Amino acid sequence: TRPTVRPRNDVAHKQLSAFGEYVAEILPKYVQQVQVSCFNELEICIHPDGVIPVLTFLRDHSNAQFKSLADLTAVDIPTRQNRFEIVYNLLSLRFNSRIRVKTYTDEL
Amino acid sequence: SNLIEVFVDGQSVMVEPGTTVLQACEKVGMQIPRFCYHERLSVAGNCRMCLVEIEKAPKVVAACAMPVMKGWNILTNSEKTKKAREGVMEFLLANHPLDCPICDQGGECDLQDQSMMFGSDRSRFLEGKRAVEDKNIGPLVKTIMTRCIQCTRCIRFASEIAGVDDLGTTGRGNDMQVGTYIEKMFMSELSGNIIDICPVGALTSKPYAFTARPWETRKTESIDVMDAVG
Amino acid sequence: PLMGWASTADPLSNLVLTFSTKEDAVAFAEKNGWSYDVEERKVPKPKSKSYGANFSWNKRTRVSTK
Amino acid sequence: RFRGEHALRRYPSGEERCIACKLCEAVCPAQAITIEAEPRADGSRRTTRYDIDMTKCIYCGFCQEACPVDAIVEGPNFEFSTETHEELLYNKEKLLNNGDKWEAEIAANIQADYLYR
Amino acid sequence: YSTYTFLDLNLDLSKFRMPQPSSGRESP
Amino acid sequence: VHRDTPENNPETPFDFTPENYKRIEAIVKNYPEGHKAAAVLPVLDLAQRQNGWLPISAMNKVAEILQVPPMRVYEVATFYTMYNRKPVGKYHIQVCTTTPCMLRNSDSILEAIQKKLGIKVGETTPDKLFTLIEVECLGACVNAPMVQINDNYYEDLTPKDIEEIIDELKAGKIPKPGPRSGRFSCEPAGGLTSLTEPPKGPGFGVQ
Amino acid sequence: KVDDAKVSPPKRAEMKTSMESLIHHFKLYTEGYQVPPGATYTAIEAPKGEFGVY
Amino acid sequence: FGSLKDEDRIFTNLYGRHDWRLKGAQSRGDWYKTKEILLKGPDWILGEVKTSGLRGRGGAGFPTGLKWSFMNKPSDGRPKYLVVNADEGEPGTCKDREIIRHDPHKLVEGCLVGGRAMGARAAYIYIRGEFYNEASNLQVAIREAYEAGLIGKNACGSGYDFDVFVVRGAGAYICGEETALIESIEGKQGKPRLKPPFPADVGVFGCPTTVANVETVAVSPTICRRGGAWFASFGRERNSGTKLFNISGHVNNPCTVEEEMSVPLKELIEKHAGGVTGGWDNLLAVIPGGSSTPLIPKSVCETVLMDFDALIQAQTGLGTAAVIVMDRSTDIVKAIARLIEFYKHESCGQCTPCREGVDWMNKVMARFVRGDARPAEIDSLWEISKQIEGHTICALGDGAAWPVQGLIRHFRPELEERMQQFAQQHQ
C-alpha cells in the first residue's frame, strides 16, 4: 500500500497452501480442520484421539520431517463447551517451515 | 408483504417501505458514525457525518434522513465513503480548543472515539481557532460553549420533551452561539438531564465537576427510590 | 489508617468473564457449583421515525428554531 | 537523561505546574500513583492528595513522558537509603520540597534534551 | 421615493378586497 | 462586535401608535389562519419604522401580539441584516463594495469620503447622524459604485458626488436619487433606440 | 518512529500546537492500540538459545 | 447553432425600456388577448412551453416547461400556492430591477396564466427589502389593473381568478436557493431544509407549491402567445429562445444587453458599444457568469458562443448571464478574493462542510493575495475545494468551490511570482 506497511509474498502463501493440502487427504480419520494463517503459517485441527499418530506420521517421513518440538502450550477458554486448547508446534529442520497442532480437550 | 428487499454491502435484508439507510444498516449490525441524530429526538441533517456511497450513483447522500427505495446496493465501506468521513471530520476539529487535560468528558467524548477509529491522522490548519465566551444557566449545568460542535442536539431537546422553549440558534455563518440571548435562567424538572445529551464537553455537571475520570469507576446497576415509578 | 488506600480482603472482587450466550452462561455456574441470578437482554423499539413529518398542515408535529 | 528521585516542578512565580489531568497514574505499569483531585476554591482544578510509593516504583519513565503540562519529572539524584518502610511512601508536600530543593539541576537537564522528544 | 407611506401599499385597497380570504384550516 | 444584551434598557418602553395597530389587521388577513402564526417579518420591521432602531423591549412586545415564545423572536431579529439593535443615525449610508464595484473604481469613492467628511472609516460620525457601513449584492454592478440611502439609491458615483452627496446632506438637500450623469434610462448606448414601434404583429396565439 | 500515529506517539512539540495530536496522544495513553485477532508465533536468536512468544 | 446569431431586433419578448414605466392602459403588447388564453384547459398550456423547452433562468437547467407539467401532483385534499422569486443574489446580476423598472404590467399577465397550469390558490412573490422604491411602485402597479376589475376573484370570464401577495425579506439568503424561501415565508430563521426530503413540490408551506424565477414566468405570456416555430430561434437544438444579458466590469458603456442563444463573446461584448479596455493584446480575462463561474483567459471562450454546452465544453457553464472582465490594471488574484470574502457574509451556518470550510479558505486566501512564504499549499487549497461538492445541502457549497477551483487552474505564475517577491523581500 505504502511504506511502513508489511510487504507480503505469494510464494510461501502458495507453497504452504499446497503442502498441507495433503495432510488432510492422507489421514482423514483425525484431521478435521486445516486453515492457512495469513502470515504464512499453518494450523491443523486434530481430534484428541489422534494425539499420538499425527505426530508419529510427522515425526519421521521423507516429505515432512518436523523433528523439533519448539513449544507446547495450553490455553483455557470458558464458553466453548469443551474448555481448554492444547497447541503443539513443530519445526521442519530440513525445510524451514512451521505447523501447529491444535487439539481441543476437556478437564476430565 | 409490504417490504423492500434491499441489499446492504452485497447481502440481502428486508425492511419496511419507509425506513432509513441508518436503521437498515443498523439491522445487519453496523454503526455509521452519528452526530446529529439521537433516537428519542427529531431528525436534522446539519453535521453531514453519515455519508454512505450508494452504488451506481455519482453523488453521496446522508443516511440519517432519506427513505430507502427499491433495492439499492448500500455500499458502506468503499473508496468514496472513506474519503468523506475523513474529510468531514477534519473540519470541525479545527475550530476547537486543545483541551483534554481538564475538560470533563475526557473518557467518552465523540470527537475522540471517532477520531482514532474513523477520521484523519494529522492536522493542517495551522493557526486560527475562534474563541467564543461562556455564561451561566443554572447551578446545575456548568456551561463552556467554547467547545460546541454546534450539532443542535440540545436545542431540539427543549422544543421536544422538556417543553420549555428557551434555547435557540443565534447568528449567521461561523458567528453563532447556542445559549439563551437574554440572561434568563433555564430550570425545570428534567433540566439537568441535558448533560447526557450533549455529545462533547460543553454541558457538564456542576457538583461532580472536577473529581474523577470515567475509566476508574465501578458500574453496578441499581434502582432509585425517591419517587413513584422508581 | 496510614494513607487512605481503600484496602480490602474479599479476594475475588475483580473477575469479569465474557460468555457468548445465555445457553452457555448458566452452564458454568453449575459446573463449579455456585448460585446465580439471571438478568435479561433488552433491545429497543424498532421504531417509526421519518424526517419530512416535521412539517404539517393540520398535525401537531411541526418544529421550528432550526 | 538519567532516572532517579521524583519531583514536581512549578512555573515562574509559583503555580504548582500540575493540573490533575490523570494520565501519570493511568500508565504507571505498577500502579504507584494515587491522585484524588477536588475543585479548588479559585476555580482552577488541582490535586489534594498525591502519593508515589518509592517501592512499587519500577522506574519506567512513563510518568515523565505522559504528562501534557510537563510537570512530573524523574530528577537526577540517586540520594536515598532511609531506614523505615513507613517513610518511602511519598505525599504531595514531600515532592514539592524535594522538587524545589533544586530546579537549577533539573531545568538545566530538560532544556538540553527536549529537542529529541 | 418615500421611506414611510406604506399604508398606501398595505391596507388601502388590499383591505377591501383581500380576496377573500378562505385560506383553509389548519387550526393546527 | 457581539450579539448579546448586557441590560441597557429591559423596559425602554416602546409601544405602538394606534395608526399602526390597524395595519396589523391587514397582514394577518393575508396569511392562512393557524399556520399564520408568524407574520414576524413585516410586524417586527414595522416596529423599526416607528423607532429607527429597536431595543430589547420591542422584541418582548410582539411576542404578546402573536402569542409566540419570546426566543422565537430574539432568534429571527439577529439573523437578517437590515434590522438594527445598536443606536443608529438619521442618514444610514451604504457604499456597495463588491468585486465588480472594486473593478468599477471604488478606489476614489473609497476614502476621500473621510477626507471630505472627517470621521473614522466604517464608523458613525462622532456627532449624531452620519453612520457609514458597506454592503454587497444590490442589483447593478453595470453602474458605478452606487450609494444607497434609506429610501433610494444614487447611481453613477464619482468623487464629485463625494464632493456633493456628503456636502449637500450636511445642509440637508436631496442629492439626486438616481444616475447623476450618463444615461438617465440605463440604455445600451448604441442599441438604445432599436426602432420603437408596436411589437411586430401581436396575434400569433392562433396556433 | 512508525509514522502513522495510531501506533507511535507524536512529538512533544507536536502535541502542543495542533489539535489532532492530543486525541492520539491522550487516547493512546488511556487505552492502548487496537490490534486485530488471531494467534502468532516467532523466534529470534537470543544469545543462548531462542526466545519465542505465542 | 445555425447562422451564429442571436441578433438584436425590436420583435422581442420585452415591451420597452424608455417608452413608459408607470401605470398605463396596456397599449399593444400587454393584455392583447386576455380571456381567450386561459379559456382553454391546462393541457393547452401544459407542454405548450416544450416548443421552446425553456430551461429556466434561475441558475440551473431542468426546463421550466417540465417542472410545471411534470413533478406536479394533481390533488389530494390540500391547496396549492405559487412562489415567484424576485431576489437577485448573484453579485452584478441586474437582470432584475430592470424588468420591474419599466415593465411591471407583464408580470401579472402570466401570474394568473401560469397558476392555471398548476391550479394553485394564491401567489406569493418575494422582493428584497433593499429594493424599496421599485417595490413600492409594484404594489401601485397592482391597483392600476387588479383593482380595476380585470383580475380577481372571478375576473375575467373564468372561475379561476386570484390575487398576488407581496412580501419582503430583509437581507436574506434565500435568493440563491429554494426551500429556504418557503421556510423564510413562514417566519423561521431561513436555515434551509434538505433539498430532497420529499422535495419542494411535496413538502412546502403547509401544502405543495412551485418555485419559479422572474423571467421564468415573465416570458410565459408571450411564449404561450407567440409560440411557433419561433421559440426555437437561435443556438443549437439544446437551448432555444432569447435570454436577457448584462455587461459589467470594464467597458466604455456597461449597459443592459438583449440577445438570443449562442453569440460569440468576442463580437457580443465589444458590441453595445465600446470595449474600452484592451480588446486584444491586453489580457481581457473574462468570467462567464455571476459567481458560479471561474476565470477564463483570452483563449477559445472568445471563439466560443454562449450556448449552455459551449461553456460546458469548457470547464464551467453558467446560467446567471453576467459578464465581467479585467484586462490590464486590475490584479487577477485581488478581485476574486473579495468574492470568496462575500460568501463568508451570506452563508447559512448549518453544515460543517460549508461553515468552517469557507473560513478555512478565507483565512488563507487572504494570505495568497499578500504574497507570503513557501508554496505547495495551493494543492492543499485545491483539495479542500475538491472536498465540498455533495457534502453541503445547498448550492453555496458548490458555489464556493468553483471560483477557487478555476483560479488554481488556468494560471500558473499567479502567486508563484508574487510569493517569490516576498520571499525575495524577506531575503
Ligand SMILES: Cc1cc2nc3c(=O)[nH]c(=O)nc-3n(C[C@H](O)[C@H](O)[C@H](O)COP(=O)(O)O)c2cc1C
Ligand atoms: C450561484 C447561484 C446564485 C443564484 N441566485 C439566485 C437569485 O439571485 N435569485 C433566484 O431566484 N435564484 C437564484 N439561484 C437559484 C435558485 O435555486 C433558483 O431560484 C431556484 O432553484 C428556482 O430555479 P428556477 O428558475 O428553475 O425556478 C441561484 C443559484 C446559484 C447556484
Ligand code: SF4
Ligand atoms: S451544547 Fe454544544 S454539543 Fe450540545 S447541542 Fe449545543 S452546541 Fe452541540
Ligand code: SF4
Ligand atoms: S470535548 Fe472533545 S475536543 Fe473537547 S476536550 Fe473533550 S474530547 Fe477533546
Ligand code: SF4
Ligand atoms: S503531572 Fe500531568 S499527569 Fe501528573 S497529575 Fe499533573 S497534569 Fe496530571
Ligand code: SF4
Ligand atoms: S517511574 Fe514508572 S512506575 Fe514509577 S511512578 Fe513513574 S510511571 Fe509509575
Ligand code: SF4
Ligand atoms: S451550502 Fe451549507 S451553509 Fe449554505 S445553505 Fe447549504 S448547508 Fe447551509
Ligand code: FES
Ligand atoms: S450524520 Fe448526523 S446528520 Fe447525517
Ligand code: FES
Ligand atoms: S454588488 Fe455592489 S452594487 Fe451590485
